[PDB]
Design an enzyme around this catalytic site. Structure first.
Site, PDB file in Angstrom:
ATOM      1  N   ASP A  35     -10.543   2.681  -3.804  1.00 40.56           N
ATOM      2  CA  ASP A  35     -11.031   1.523  -3.075  1.00 40.56           C
ATOM      3  C   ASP A  35     -12.495   1.266  -3.400  1.00 40.56           C
ATOM      4  O   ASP A  35     -13.319   2.184  -3.417  1.00 40.56           O
ATOM      5  CB  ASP A  35     -10.977   1.757  -1.571  1.00 40.56           C
ATOM      6  CG  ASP A  35      -9.566   1.899  -1.013  1.00 40.56           C
ATOM      7  OD1 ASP A  35      -8.558   1.952  -1.770  1.00 40.56           O
ATOM      8  OD2 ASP A  35      -9.500   1.988   0.237  1.00 40.56           O
TER       9      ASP A  35
ATOM     10  N   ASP B  21       0.840  -1.179   0.000  1.00 44.83           N
ATOM     11  CA  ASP B  21       0.000   0.000   0.000  1.00 44.83           C
ATOM     12  C   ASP B  21       0.891   1.250   0.000  1.00 44.83           C
ATOM     13  O   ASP B  21       2.119   1.142   0.164  1.00 44.83           O
ATOM     14  CB  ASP B  21      -0.904  -0.070   1.252  1.00 44.83           C
ATOM     15  CG  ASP B  21      -2.255   0.617   1.078  1.00 44.83           C
ATOM     16  OD1 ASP B  21      -2.473   1.370   0.111  1.00 44.83           O
ATOM     17  OD2 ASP B  21      -3.113   0.385   1.968  1.00 44.83           O
TER      18      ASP B  21
HETATM   19  O1  LIG Z   1      -5.844   0.261   5.270  1.00 46.14           O
HETATM   20  C1  LIG Z   1      -6.076  -0.790   4.335  1.00 46.14           C
HETATM   21  C2  LIG Z   1      -6.635  -0.234   3.024  1.00 46.14           C
HETATM   22  N1  LIG Z   1      -5.739   0.782   2.497  1.00 46.14           N
HETATM   23  C3  LIG Z   1      -6.119   1.287   1.174  1.00 46.14           C
HETATM   24  C4  LIG Z   1      -6.211   0.122   0.177  1.00 46.14           C
HETATM   25  O2  LIG Z   1      -6.501   0.554  -1.139  1.00 46.14           O
HETATM   26  C5  LIG Z   1      -7.293  -0.834   0.670  1.00 46.14           C
HETATM   27  O3  LIG Z   1      -7.511  -1.920  -0.226  1.00 46.14           O
HETATM   28  C6  LIG Z   1      -6.847  -1.362   2.017  1.00 46.14           C
HETATM   29  O4  LIG Z   1      -5.622  -2.110   1.886  1.00 46.14           O
END
Ligand SMILES: OC[C@H]1NC[C@H](O)[C@@H](O)[C@H]1O
Ligand SMILES: *[C@@H]1O[C@H](CO)[C@@H](O[C@@H]2O[C@H](CO)[C@@H](O[C@@H]3O[C@H](CO[C@H]4O[C@H](CO)[C@@H](O)[C@H](O)[C@@H]4O)[C@@H](O)[C@H](O[C@H]4O[C@H](CO)[C@@H](O)[C@H](O)[C@@H]4O)[C@@H]3O)[C@H](O)[C@H]2NC(C)=O)[C@H](O)[C@H]1NC(C)=O
Ligand SMILES: *[C@@H]1O[C@H](CO)[C@@H](O[C@@H]2O[C@H](CO)[C@@H](O[C@@H]3O[C@H](CO[C@H]4O[C@H](CO)[C@@H](O)[C@H](O)[C@@H]4O)[C@@H](O)[C@H](O[C@H]4O[C@H](CO)[C@@H](O)[C@H](O)[C@@H]4O)[C@@H]3O)[C@H](O)[C@H]2NC(C)=O)[C@H](O)[C@H]1NC(C)=O
Ligand SMILES: *[C@@H]1O[C@H](CO)[C@@H](O[C@@H]2O[C@H](CO)[C@@H](O)[C@H](O)[C@H]2NC(C)=O)[C@H](O)[C@H]1NC(C)=O
Ligand SMILES: *[C@@H]1O[C@H](CO)[C@@H](O[C@@H]2O[C@H](CO)[C@@H](O)[C@H](O)[C@H]2NC(C)=O)[C@H](O)[C@H]1NC(C)=O
Ligand SMILES: *[C@@H]1O[C@H](CO)[C@@H](O)[C@H](O)[C@H]1NC(C)=O
Ligand SMILES: *[C@@H]1O[C@H](CO)[C@@H](O)[C@H](O)[C@H]1NC(C)=O
Ligand SMILES: OC[C@H]1NC[C@H](O)[C@@H](O)[C@H]1O
Lengths: 387, 400
Positions: B200, B139
Site C-alpha cells: 500500500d 482485496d
Molecule cells: O482496508 C482497505 C485497504 N486494504 C489494503 C489495500 O491494499 C488498500 O488499498 C485498502 O483497500
C-alpha cells in the site's frame, strides 16, 4: 562559550544546503558561490524583513578559499570574490548584518580547499578578526581525533586573543559520533557557542526525521547541555527548498524551535514563496525560539497513534507544545488534556496556536481538548497561565 | 482480462488513501465514508474538468458495508448510505461517471467488514451487477493462499456470468509477494484488468520511492505483462495530499505515467489547489498515460550522479522520457544525448517538455542537450520524429 555571544540561538542564512560547492560561475553566475551571491542575499535580508525579524547572520560555507599567499595568509578565490572578504564584511555590516565564514580543522576542507592545520590556527583566527568576521564554522574533515582535540580548543583561544567577538560553531562532535564517551559536552560548552552533533541535513523529509530521531533518542544527554551561549545544532532549515511539503516545512520550523536550535536558513531568498516566508518570519515562533531562558525542549509523549508531543519551558511560566503527527494517512483528531501532559496543580491556562493565531482559553488540567494534526505535520501551542 | 474494458489504464478517484476508514459522520460529516462524500466528489469530477480529461471512475473502498440481509445479500451502512448503492450508481451514471466498489476475498475486509467468502462470491458478483457497479477491487485479507487461488478466478468467472462488464482489480499478487513462482502473471492477465503487485502507498515520498524501487528492481518480469486490458497497479496517486512536495508530486505523476499505471487519485477534490489540479489535468501527460499501445516503460539509465532516465514507447514512433533526480541537494544540470539513451541512428527528433510546454527542435542522436532537474523532481519529454508532424498532415481520406 563565555564570550557574551549567542545568548539566544543564532538566526541567519548559511550557503551550504542550497548552494553547496557550485563554483561554475561561467555557466551558472547567479547560483555559484561568489561575492555576488552573498551580496544579493544580504540585500534580501535587509529589504525583505529577515534582519528585522532577527535573522542577522550571513554565513559563507565551504568552497570560498583561493589559496594561501607567500606569508601563509588565507585568500578567497580571486575570480569569485574579486573585492575580497573585508569588502564583503564591510558591506554586510553596512546593512546591519553579521558575516560568518568557514574553515576546516584539518589538512583540507571537506571539498578539498586549503585546511586550517594546527600550525595555521592562530594565523587564520587573526586573519578572520582582521577581516571583521563575526562567526566561524570550523569543519572537521581531514584530521585525526587527536588533532581535533588540540585544534578546537586552540581555535577558541586564538579567536578570543584577537579581541574581536567571533561566534564559534564547532563540528567536532559530528566527526566523533556525537555521543559520550568520545564526546565531552561539558568541554564543548566551554569552548564553543554551538556544535554540529550529527549528520548533514539533506533536502528530504527522511533527513529531517533521521535527525529528529537521533536527537530524541539521546535527549537525556543533549537536552541539559544546551543554554545561553552554548547550543546543540541539528543543522540548517530546509524551508524554501524542494524536498519538504508545506506540512513538513511547518513541522521543521516548530520542532527546531522547541529544540532551541539555530534558525539558519539555506534557501534562495531571491525567489522564496510567500508561504515559506510566512513560516520563517512567524513572530511568535521566533519569540519562542529566542526565549531568554534558553531551555531546550524534549519529547514528553509518544502514542501508539503515532502522535508525539514535545514541550519546551519558556520565560514567565509559559510553555511551547508541539503536537507532531508521524502518521502517513490523513488528518488525526488528537484528544488530550494538560493533566495528561504533566501539567500539575490548579493553574488555568490560555493557548495561542502559533500557526493559526487562534486562542484557546480557560484550560484547566482536566479540560479535554482536541487538536487536528495533518500527516507529517504539527500543531503548535504557546501556553501560559492566566487570571 | 478480455472483457472489453480498460484498453488504456483506468483513471478516476478512489476513497482509500485520503479518507481511509473514517466512519464517524456524527463528528466528521464532511469527511466520513458516506454517500454524501461520493456524491460531492462526483459533482467535482463532472464540473471541474476531471471527467472531461478522462477521470471517469469514482471508487468506493473499504468500510461501506452495513451487513448482510436475511438472504445473505450485502447492504451498505444504512446510516451512511441511506438511499442505497443503486441510487448512488444512478447518480454517478447521470454525470457520465462510473462507480467502483470494494469487497474482500476472505472472511472479512481488512478493516473487519463482511468478507466475500468463497460461498458468497457469486451472490456478491450478482448483487454488484444488479446495482449497476462498473468496477470491483477485490482485496485479500483474512484468506489463505488456497482460498485466493480458488477465489480470484471464481470471482472473474462470476462477474463474467452476470453479463455486465465490470472492471476487475485484483489484489491477489500483493498478498503473495508479487513475484514468480508464487504469482503467475499469465493467469492474472487472463482473469483481471489490473492488479496491485505490491505494498500500500502511504502519504510520503519514502513510500513512492519504495514502490518505484520495487517496480524497477523487478521490471524485467513486470514490464512485459502490462498491456491493454491488463495493467500493473503501483497504487494511488498522492497528488493533492500532505506528504509530497511540488517536485515530488510532479515526479509521481510522470513516473506513474511512464509505468502505464492507473491514474487513480485519492484526495479532497473539493479543496485541491490549482497547482495540484494542473499536474493531474495536464493534457499531454494524460495522452501519454492513455497511449493506445499500452506498453509499460522502463528505467533505461541510472548514473552515479543519482540521475535516472525512464523511457516509455508510444504510438507513432514517439517516446516519453523522464529524467528523474534522486539527489537531495540542488538543481542538477544533466548532460546527455539521445544516442547515449539508446536511440538508433539517422532519425531527427523534436521534444515537448510535458510540464513547461517548451519545444526543443533539431535533436539528432549525436546532439548534446542539457536538462535542469530539481531534487526529488523530474523533467519529462514527449519525443517524436520531426517527420511525423509532416506525415500526420498528409493522410488522404475517402468516403464509403
Ligand atoms: O482496508 C482497505 C485497504 N486494504 C489494503 C489495500 O491494499 C488498500 O488499498 C485498502 O483497500
Ligand atoms: C575572552 O574570554 C574571556 C574569558 O572567558 C571573556 O571574558 C568573559 O566575558 C563574559 C561575557 O562578557 C563575562 O561574563 C559576564 O560577567 C558579568 C560580570 O561578572 C562579574 O562578576 C563575576 C563574579 O560574580 C566575575 O567572575 C567577573 O569577572 C565579573 O567581574 C556578568 O554580569 C554577566 O552576566 C551575564 O549573564 C547573566 C545570566 O547568566 C545575564 O543575566 C546578564 O545579562 C549577562 O549576560 C556575564 O556573566 C565574564 O566575566 C568574562 N570573564 C573574564 C575573566 O573577563 C571575553 O569576553 C572573551 N573575549 C572575546 C573577544 O571573545
Ligand atoms: C466473458 O468472457 C468472454 C471471453 O471468454 C468475453 O468475450 C470477449 O469479449 C470481448 C469484448 O467484447 C470481445 O472482444 C471484441 O471482439 C470484437 C469482434 O471480434 C470477433 O471477431 C473477429 C473476426 O475478425 C475474431 O477474430 C475475434 O476473435 C472475435 O471473435 C472486436 O471487434 C472488438 O474490438 C474492440 O477493440 C478494438 C481495438 O482493439 C476496437 O477498434 C473496437 O472498436 C472494439 O472495441 C473486441 O476485440 C472478444 O471477442 C470476446 N472473446 C471471446 C473469446 O468471445 C466477454 O466479454 C465476457 N463478458 C463479460 C460480461 O465480462
Ligand atoms: C596531512 O598532511 C600531513 C603532512 O603532509 C600528512 O603527512 C604526510 O603524509 C604523506 C602521505 O601519506 C606521507 O608520505 C608523509 O611522509 C607525511 N609527512 C609528514 C611530514 O607527516 C598527513 O598524512 C595528513 N593527515 C591527514 C589526517 O590526512
Ligand atoms: C476464516 O473463517 C473460518 C471459519 O471460522 C476459519 O476456519 C476455522 O479455522 C480454525 C483455525 O484456523 C480451525 O480450527 C477450524 O476448524 C475452522 N472452523 C471451521 C468452521 O471451518 C478460518 O481459519 C478463517 N480463515 C482465516 C484465513 O482467517
Ligand atoms: C474527558 O473525556 C473523557 C473520555 O475520554 C471523559 O470520560 C471525562 O469525563 C472527560 N473529562 C472531563 C473533565 O470532562
Ligand atoms: C558532446 O559533448 C562531449 C563532451 O561532453 C564532446 O566531446 C562532444 O564533441 C559533444 N558532441 C557534439 C555533437 O557536440
Ligand atoms: O564541505 C562542506 C560541508 N562539510 C560538512 C558539513 O557538516 C556541512 O555542513 C558543510 O559545511
Amino acid at each position: 562559550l563565555d564570550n557574551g555571544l549567542l545568548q539566544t540561538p543564532p538566526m541567519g542564512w548559511l550557503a551550504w544546503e542550497r548552494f553547496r560547492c557550485n563554483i561554475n560561475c561561467d555557466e551558472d553566475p547567479k547560483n555559484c558561490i561568489s561575492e555576488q551571491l552573498f551580496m544579493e542575499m544580504a540585500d534580501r535580508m535587509a529589504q525583505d524583513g529577515w534582519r528585522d525579524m532577527g535573522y542577522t547572520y550571513l554565513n559563507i560555507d565551504d568552497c570560498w578559499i583561493g589559496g594561501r599567499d607567500a606569508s601563509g595568509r588565507l585568500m578567497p578565490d580571486p575570480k569569485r570574490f574579486p573585492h575580497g572578504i573585508p569588502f564583503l564584511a564591510d558591506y554586510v555590516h553596512s546593512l546591519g548584518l553579521k558575516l560568518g565564514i568557514y574553515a576546516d580543522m584539518g589538512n583540507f576542507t571537506c571539498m578539498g580547499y586549503p585546511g586550517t592545520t594546527l600550525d595555521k590556527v592562530v594565523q587564520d583566527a587573526q586573519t578572520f578578526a582582521e577581516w571583521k568576521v563575526d562567526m566561524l564554522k570550523l569543519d572537521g574533515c581531514f584530521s585525526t581525533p587527536e588533532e581535533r582535540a588540540q585544534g578546537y580548543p586552540k581555535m577558541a583561544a586564538a579567536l578570543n586573543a584577537t579581541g574581536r567577538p567571533i561566534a564559534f560553531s564547532c563540528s567536532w562532535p559530528a566527526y566523533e559520533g556525537g555521543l559520550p564517551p568520545r564526546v565531552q559536552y561539558s568541554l564543548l560548552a566551554d569552548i564553543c557557542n554551538l556544535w554540529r552533533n550529527y549528520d548533514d541535513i539533506q533536502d528530504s523529509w527522511w533527513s529531517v526525521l533521521s535527525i529528529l530521531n537521533w536527537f530524541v533518542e539521546h535527549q537525556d544527554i543533549l537536552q541539559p547541555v544546551a543554554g545561553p551561549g552554548h547550543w546543540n545544532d541539528p543543522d540548517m532549515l530546509l524551508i524554501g527548498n524542494f524536498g519538504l511539503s508545506l506540512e513538513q516545512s511547518r513541522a521543521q520550523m516548530a520542532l527546531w524551535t522547541v529544540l532551541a536550535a539555530p534558525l539558519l536558513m539555506s534557501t534562495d531568498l531571491r525567489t522564496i514563496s510567500a508561504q515559506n516566508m510566512d513560516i520563517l518570519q512567524n513572530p511568535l515562533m521566533i519569540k519562542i525560539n529566542q526565549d531568554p531562558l534558553g531551555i531546550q525542549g524534549r519529547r514528553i509523549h509518544k502514542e501508539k497513534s503515532l502522535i508525539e508531543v514535545y514541550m519546551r519551558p519558556l520565560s514567565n511560566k509559559a510553555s511551547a507544545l508541539v503536537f507532531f503527527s508521524c502518521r502517513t494517512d490523513m488528518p488525526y483528531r488528537y484528544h488530550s488534556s494538560l493533566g495528561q501532559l504533566n501539567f500539575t496543580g490548579s493553574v488555568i491556562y490560555e493557548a495561542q496556536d502559533v500557526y493559526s493565531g487562534d486562542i484557546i482559553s480557560g484550560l484547566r488540567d482536566e479540560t479535554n481538548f482536541t487538536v487536528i494534526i495533518n500527516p507529517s505535520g504539527v500543531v503548535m501551542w504557546y501556553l501560559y497561565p492566566i487570571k
